[PDB]
């Protein structure tokens, strides 16, 4: 039959209001405030956490403040292991109320909520990002959110910790928690190596031209939303590649200029004409390596025929010392993919190369280069096949 959920004779249930809050959270779960580690109240037998609020698939969870320690987690038996401190909902448990409304003594022991230590494969099997209490095909009764990596030493020591920032709704994304900016940087300058194809380092270190003869590795301001992307965990790829943590349609914006651009000088032989040199800036995706996503999670397989390379800028050098460019594209990206930018040109500097024979500021380089990567759409349902291939 046709059932009303919100109608005059309907009864609004806990699962109902949780389904509503989850919708209002854009289906993202996470710590809204607090719930950070309290090292002052942390011993070799207990782990303390500060007061706070979290939402786990529409269910509101609170750690209350009193007198500190706001909450204590038992670490007895945990030793020489790296574990995940998790906030878990278990709907098989029974919440035990006591006292009464009428007296001011109503209280509930929420057995459906626990703070616990899980190993990575156990967390992954019940991770909110992959499984749901509200799921249509495989509904679950137990779901978890990892808060910290906890590394226990020898019996008698206090553990080392690392916050799982993807599960904290800190700042930057509050009104649009599942979307917004994935990555952005300030303008930077980067020397173009004398090769046909090279990646542009987008993760905060550029090879900056500093003199007429030299360039040097220099930091530039960069920011990443840990819920959406991360710097590649492999050192070979760490300067250049992002790992996508969330499927979606993303928008890539790039701008900058090619400085000391090469071209064939107008001479009597070529009828006093500039001989332009072709170059292209491409964005790229690659999913050959599995388990690059956070916790080594299984990558999300893309639809058959998915793009791998997309031309953002494709033209010739125009005979000027410096030539600006800009491009904006929407692209599909999947959890586990590598995403990167490449500069392409010919390798013969006297015929087809956009780069010259100089080094440092005398050599061809990218100047005032910057980008923004932003999540703008999801790939759920039919969009996976209709929108996911490009």
């Amino acid at each position: 039959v046709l059932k009303g959920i919100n109608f005059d004779r309907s009864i609004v249930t806990p699962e109902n209001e949780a389904s509503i809050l989850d919708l209002a959270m854009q289906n993202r779960s996470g710590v809204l405030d607090g719930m950070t580690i309290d090292i002052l109240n942390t011993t070799s037998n207990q782990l303390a956490l500060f007061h706070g609020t979290a939402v786990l698939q529409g269910y509101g969870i609170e750690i209350t403040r009193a007198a500190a320690p706001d909450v204590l987690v038992d670490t007895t038996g945990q030793s020489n292991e790296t574990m995940l401190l998790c906030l878990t909902i278990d709907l098989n448990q029974v919440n035990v109320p006591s006292g009464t409304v009428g007296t001011n003594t109503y209280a509930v022991d929420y057995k459906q909520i626990r703070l616990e230590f899980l190993d990575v494969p156990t967390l992954l099997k019940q991770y909110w990002r992959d499984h749901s209490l509200h799921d249509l095909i495989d509904p679950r009764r137990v779901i978890s959110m990892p808060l910290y990596w906890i590394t226990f030493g020898q019996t008698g020591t206090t553990p080392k910790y690392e916050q799982i920032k993807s599960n904290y709704i800190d700042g930057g994304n509050s009104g649009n928690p599942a979307y917004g900016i994935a990555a952005r940087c300030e303008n930077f300058n980067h020397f173009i190596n004398k090769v046909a194809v090279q990646s542009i380092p987008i993760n905060g270190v550029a090879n900056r031209p500093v003199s007429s003869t030299a360039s040097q590795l220099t930091n530039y301001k960069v920011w990443r939303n840990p819920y959406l992307c991360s710097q590649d965990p492999r050192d070979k790829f760490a300067p250049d590649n992002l790992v996508i943590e969330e499927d979606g349609i993303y928008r890539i914006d790039i701008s900058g200029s090619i400085n000391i651009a090469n071209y064939t000088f107008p001479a009597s032989g070529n009828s006093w004409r500039v001989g332009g040199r072709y170059f292209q800036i491409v964005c790229a995706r690659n999913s050959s390596a599995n388990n690059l996503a956070e916790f080594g999670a299984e990558q999300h397989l893309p639809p058959s025929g998915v793009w791998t390379r997309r031309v953002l800028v494709g033209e010739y050098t125009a005979g000027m010392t410096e030539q600006a460019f800009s491009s904006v594209a929407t692209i599909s990206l999947f959890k586990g993919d590598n995403f990167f930018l490449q500069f392409e040109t010919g390798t013969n500097t006297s015929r087809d190369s956009a780069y010259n024979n100089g080094y440092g500021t005398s050599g061809t380089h990218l100047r005032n280069f910057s980008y923004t990567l932003e999540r703008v759409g999801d790939l759920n349902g039919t969009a996976y096949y209709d929108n996911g291939t490009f």
Copy 2:
């Protein structure tokens, strides 16, 4: 007086929680999951639909699953007609509860909800996209959402169906259901016809240069959000024009290059200088034709003085084989408008044209062209006059 809705002594009503959910849905109504046609359980007297959830102006509607058929709709009397299968709320009806809380027998016969067949003019008069149960000036008591076009044959046959995808919140837009991408495509190449003004085909078929002498009509990947736009229903305009289904401020992004660009060769007569050729890429809107929107709905009239053409790129060819361009603009668009892109230049190839005398890859063409159209703002209230003219 000043009335609190959500305060300590307030009573939260069904209309209240529905007004809240509608706000959380960005005022969009639609099927959240399921509610697709079940052809196995569909006969010549009954039409079956699968279990699912929908939200209609903040009211949650559910089709429950048991044992299939999840729901049955009576088709007796319906013959040789094209009808709309609609999900309707009728607040003049009375929901009849039975049983009691205390026993586990409470149940409601939701007479305020029906699955019914309506003709197009009846649906349009009570369509959620134009009328509201919550409306300030003209509040309604009956509102509908069309799910399928149902074409009934002769008495004794099973009907033909077509899903109304604009009313299904499938994928791509989940956390931002009333906004997000309207249209996007992969990079494509398109031959420039030897004319002053031409539309750029944005609906998935381009005239691709394939040899030094020929171009051929070739499909490219394109995606449209049916809630926001559709391919023009008239075959004359179908390769080039979108029909806007929803008023708003939209963002248009374009990028690509002009390949084999024409220019006046540097000769002794012009003092060995490149003679550039002017061209422009414009976006355009046109509302002269009424009833282009879904169901032949009345177009939304724009404010007096509304724009019709906007220059996105305006410059000269620079004497290079290929020259890149990019542009981003925000524009107002109205339900029923045609939206399209045009390429403009002179027609004298020896004096003012950006195009040459070649064909296929030897002729001037757009290369690596792509666009994104996205809804970024609404045109309700004062924004209609202040923001709606440009």
Copy 3:
């Protein structure tokens, strides 16, 4: 302990549903409909307001309609003063219910809600944009939203009014009330003054080239979201500067062309080659002047090392009559900042200037220039330091 808010044994309180609605409003408060001044029912002792709905930090407030006047505010004693008509929540007050559910006589006198006149410093101390009933560190019990500037004359006169549009959720932003477009304009043409550095007038008046000898100040279509930005209140800066009203990560899009661009003519002395002229378009922020934000509110101090200038386009003129450009960047902006765009070039027209010696249409000018400024992210929590410096 671990407390559930939305669980099976939980009791959902008024503060709970208000916290949920505030989340659904992206933490923005404001009038959703109506609540505009009713001058027909306004006298020298009373001020009338029309029926409407507002949300103040998740609490729903309603002015009910009956028979007009929908509500009356006492103005006795108010004279020769500029005051703020405010909608205030005071949780120290007690809402007084009367009658009963069972009879159809339940009614509440909402003493926790008032319409009142406050001076600017009192409003600022309890302004919802700076303080919260839900605040973690400094929770408040009294919070206000200003609706109108009310200027009272001599005893016996009806007052003058000015709507505070930043506190009315009118149109343009309904589904994304705290984000969306801040400012946008139609294409305009602007003469480039013969100077090294100049601001580009973004607030609706451009110096339009109209003849081969003259340019004239001409209006162009522009729109600003008053919640996000305003035209500079100082006449010296009013044509060029925006005042940012809300912290965040913003996206700036620019496009246009440089028409009648200057360059060194190819002559025998320079080996028949175009001598390009460097120019750059920069966006800029400046927070030296405090109290530029609405009501003269204290500016939000940026993190140490914050950017002030960012190159959007940096290149040489290419020897063409007209050269197009486009750029998209994300930038941090703070409440109280000035935001503006600048055009930069050399001042020697025979050696390094992108501008020539002409005036009007014969002189170098920006053609088809337009921009969009949009709020795309917040700067709360850790994002303030990690994302706020660029």
